[PDB]
C-alpha cells in the first residue's frame, strides 16, 4: 500500500479537487483527504502532482486496467473525446464558471441572473453537450468514464442553479450525480 | 497512408496549433495544414478531435512507440509531469497570454509594459520553470518531449518581446525554438 493523500480546499467546493477525488474513488484506491484554508495537489510515497486531469491520468497509467477499475475508454477514439471534453471544460465556458461558481453546486448558493456573456458560454455548452449525448446514452461512451462526471459538474452550475437546462441534460446531469463516488464527495460538505 | 488535416488560424499565430503541429511533425506524419480566416481542429479520416493537448495524447495512443517515434515520456512520473505542465500552461498564466499574445512570438509584435499582475504573473511562471529545469538539462526530462515546446512558448512570449527573463530560462526556451519542427511552423509565417 502506497501512502495516498488528496489536497482539498477547505470547503471542499473545488470542482477539480472532485474529479481527483473522483478518480482515486473509482480505482478503489486507499487515501487520505487534507485541506488548506494549488489544490488538488496528489502525493503518492515521495511523488507530488498537480492539474486534476494529470493526476486522472497518471492513475490510469500506474494502476493500470484491467487490474485496477478503468478511468479512461478503452478505444482510442472515445479516449481522445474524453480528454477533448477535459480539456475544453478547464479551458473555455469562464463566464459559466465565473457566474456559476460551485458554492451554487455544494452549497446550494444563488447568484444574479446571467450576463449576455453567460447566456451564449451556456447556449455552447448546451450545442455542445446535446451533440456530445446525441444518442441520449447516460454515459458520454457507453460506460462512465472521468470526463462524465466533469461535464455534469459544468451542467450542474446551472441545473443546480435553477438555470434552465434543456430536459435531456438535466437528466444527464442529475444521473452523473448520483454516481457513488461524487455522493462520498458531496457528503464532506454537506457537514 | 491515412488522409490527415490541421487546421490553423490564418497567421499561424495559435500556440495551440504550434503545439499539434509539432506533435504531428515529431510523430513524422503526413499531413496538409489548411487555414481558418475553434483551431487547431485535427482530421483524421472520418474522425475529428480538437484541444491540443488531447490531440497530441491521441496521435501518441494511436501511432504508438517504439514504432512511431516518442512525444511523452516513457517514465510514469515524468509523463505525469509532462501533462500536468501543459494543463497548467493552458489553465493559468492568464496574464502573460494577454498581454504578451503570440504575435510578440511569431510577428515581433510590441506591446505596453507589463500590469503589476502580469510582472507577478512572469515571475510565478520563472519560480516554476526553474524549479522545474533546476538540473539545468536542455530538455525537461533528458530526452525531448511536447511539453517542452509549450513551455518554451510560453517563456518566449517574454524573452522574445525583450522582457527582463533569468539567463538560464532564455537559454532554455531558445534552445526549444530551435527544434526543426518548431522552426517549421515559425516558416509559416515568415513569409
Ligand atoms: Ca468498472
Ligand atoms: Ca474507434
Ligand atoms: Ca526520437
Ligand atoms: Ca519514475
Chains 1, 2 share one sequence.
Not at 64 to 77: M, V
Not at 93 to 118: C, N, S, W, Y
Request: charged content about 25%; glycine content about 4%; some cysteine.
Amino acid at each position: 500500500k502506497p501512502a495516498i493523500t488528496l489536497w482539498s480546499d477547505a470547503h471542499f467546493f473545488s470542482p477539480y479537487v472532485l474529479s481527483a477525488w473522483v478518480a482515486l474513488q473509482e480505482k478503489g484506491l486507499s487515501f487520505h483527504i487534507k485541506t488548506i484554508d494549488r489544490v488538488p495537489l496528489l502525493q503518492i510515497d515521495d511523488f507530488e502532482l498537480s492539474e486534476s486531469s494529470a493526476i486522472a491520468e497518471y492513475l490510469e497509467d500506474r494502476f493500470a486496467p484491467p487490474t485496477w477499475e478503468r478511468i479512461y475508454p478503452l478505444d482510442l477514439e472515445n479516449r481522445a473525446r474524453a480528454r477533448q471534453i477535459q480539456a475544453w471544460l478547464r479551458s473555455d465556458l469562464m463566464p459559466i464558471r465565473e457566474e456559476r461558481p460551485t458554492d451554487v453546486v455544494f452549497a446550494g448558493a444563488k447568484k444574479a441572473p446571467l450576463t449576455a456573456e453567460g447566456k451564449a458560454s451556456a447556449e455552447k455548452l448546451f450545442a455542445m453537450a446535446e451533440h456530445l449525448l446525441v444518442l441520449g446514452q447516460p454515459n458520454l461512451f457507453g460506460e462512465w468514464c472521468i470526463a462524465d462526471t466533469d461535464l455534469a459538474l459544468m451542467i450542474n452550475r446551472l441545473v443546480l442553479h435553477g438555470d434552465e437546462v434543456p430536459e435531456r441534460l438535466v437528466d444527464y446531469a442529475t444521473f452523473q450525480w448520483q454516481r457513488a463516488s461524487v455522493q462520498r464527495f458531496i457528503a464532506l460538505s454537506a457537514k
